[PDB]
């Protein structure tokens with residue numbers, strides 16, 4: 001027979017516990033606001049019962065009422081002390097229960113008066129569990145209140161250990177409390193960092209390559225039409241050029257431009273740059289001189305490895321080292337002493353720019369080794385395999401063709417320029433020589449599925465939305481996904497049946513992929529969001545673009561992990577595979593090229609007769625997006641004149657397929673161009 005102080009924050013004042021206490025003729029005072037020592041109520045309180053109160057009482061108040069302040073906290077203390085106990089008890093998968101304990105100096109650390117276990121079914125939502133636990137602890141309080149008042153119960157100190165969480169710890173998970181226990185723990189596995197001690201990377205690529213050369217020295221390494229070089233021959237010739245290159249001042253993180261057609265000299269030059277210590281800057285010779293001079297200027301590359309056929313195209317801007325000049329090779333054929341760390345730059349490839357000119361993507365040796373070290377065991381690549389070096393060597397799809405197969409002892413086959421686009425002769429060569437594994441761009445892959453091939457066992461594809469699955473061959477089709485920034489690819493799917501949306505697969509080694517909403521919070525399984533990549537595949541950033549590195553390579557505020565903002569939208573499927581749901585941004589992947597349609601606008605608008613331009617992507621029935629360039633000009637400009645105009649500054653793949661002349665552009669109510677209202681032919 002006294003007075004009771006009920007201190008709560010979220011709970012309702014019409015609770016069963018409150019009504020029960022008043023039924024025992026106890027006058028109860030409900031108070032949610034902060035109480036201080038000078039409060040007029042503190043002198044008339046006989047008992048203080050708190051129940052998930054959102055604040056701590058001043059140490060003066062807690063000591064004055066020592067031995068008479070109790071808290072009903074619905075967790076199995078010491079597990080899940082403090083905030084959001086039920087959620088953390090489920091996420092961390094700790095034992096579950098409710099505990100009525102004394103309040104001591106710290107948060108939910110006092111001795112336990114009463115403790116009871118509870119169980120949650122898999123189908124219950126986190127709200128159901130929260131409610132079920134709240135009901136169980138209230139009934140526990142109703143049965144044991146008489147024992148608590150009379151002090152009959154013997155409090156016992158908490159076990160040593162436990163965890164602790166604060167209010168902000170849940171910000172990252174605010175959108176998650178609406179999911180079944182099964183679905184929640186399913187997301188936890190898909191977003192669980194691998195167990196502490198995960199295999200790191202200590203070696204550089206050429207360290208592993210030379211090791212593999214000494215394992216299969218007389219095995220065919222590279223094949224170019226009739227000629228071919230073995231691993232021993234390739235390793236020695238590259239070492240000769242590397243000694244000469246190193247002797248000319250090539251240092252770690254230095255850039256060495258390479259401008260050559262696909263050939264044996266290319267592979268020799270590529271490895272020579274690595275062994276020398278620097279990173280190679282591939283420059284497709286089909287680029288216009290404007291583009292070539294730009295890459296040479298922006299990149300801090302003084303050395304340009306090229307031939308005499310294309311030497312003049314550089315206009316003496318760089319100290320040229322002709323790959324045909326015999327004095328470019330030293331007598332020394334031994335492997336050079338390794339001077340590179342896995343954190344050093346291995347190459348700098350150029351992709352399209354977001355707002356303006358393109359940015360050199362810096363890829364490290366720890367981003368290529370991780371990819372090759374996963375590729376070889378997963379696909380079971382062996383020296384018996386012969387791989388096609390098909391993709392243009394300025395795109396990282398060529399790094400897949402070349403580097404992953406060399407570490408596996410396989411043989412590289414440079415695709416002859418004549419048979420490159422005549423897939424009939426390519427398939428003929430592949431059936432004759434026995435080409436077993438190769439990566440083919442989506443365009444070439446679909447065309448190859450029609451052939452009656454029987455030699456290949458693994459064809460890897462990717463880069464564009466695959467739609468055709470039917471093929472007469474017995475080879476496993478593999479669909480891969482990943483941006484250049486995250487090293488070649490990050491996910492892999494084994495295609496087995498038709499799908500309305502062929503998934504891109506599961507993450508590769510040491511790669512976590514997070515689906516986050518606009519607020520960067522985790523998305524529940526089945527909820528769309530931005531695909532965030534975490535792990536060893538992350539690059540060093542963009543060359544000479546630190547502002548974009550900070551924007552795209554962010555350190556998560558709650559998690560603290562370094563992640564790359566891809567700008568891509570994706571979702572986790574229930575089975576773990578990822579579904580690609582397009583991209584927020586202006587970009588679009590057209591036949592293997594990441595382009596900014598707006599990055600053509602300055603060149604185009606710079607034309608005297610051109611006032612405004614907007615390049616959109618339109619698909620004709622079969623879903624394949626192509627670019628139409630609408631422009632407002634007085635008179636229509638000849639199609640070929642614009643293609644040559646863009647050809648002076650842009651590569652062929654950045655030249656829109658169609659250009660449409662218009663007298664004026666349609667506008668929205670807000671003044672924006674009404675992109676929806678533009679025609680198409």
Ligand SMILES: *P(=O)(O)OCC(C)(C)[C@@H](O)C(=O)NCCC(=O)NCCS[C@@H](CS(=O)(=O)NC[C@H]1O[C@@H](n2cnc3c(N)ncnc32)[C@H](O)[C@@H]1O)[C@H](N)C(C)C
Pocket residue numbers: 351390391392395396397398441443444461462463464465466479480481482483484485488489504566568580589591592593594652653
């Ligand atoms: P023609 O055009 O004049 O001659 C060209 C031909 C036709 C001969 C062609 O065979 C060729 O030579 N292609 C070489 C060009 C090339 O290799 N480009 C690189 C491909 S993109 C690369 C990484 S990326 O640059 O960052 N772009 C990937 C982004 O696109 C999305 N993506 C990735 N995978 C996708 C699939 N399977 N479907 C749909 N979209 C996909 C992501 O947002 C990526 O950010 C990727 N990684 C490939 C696989 C190397």
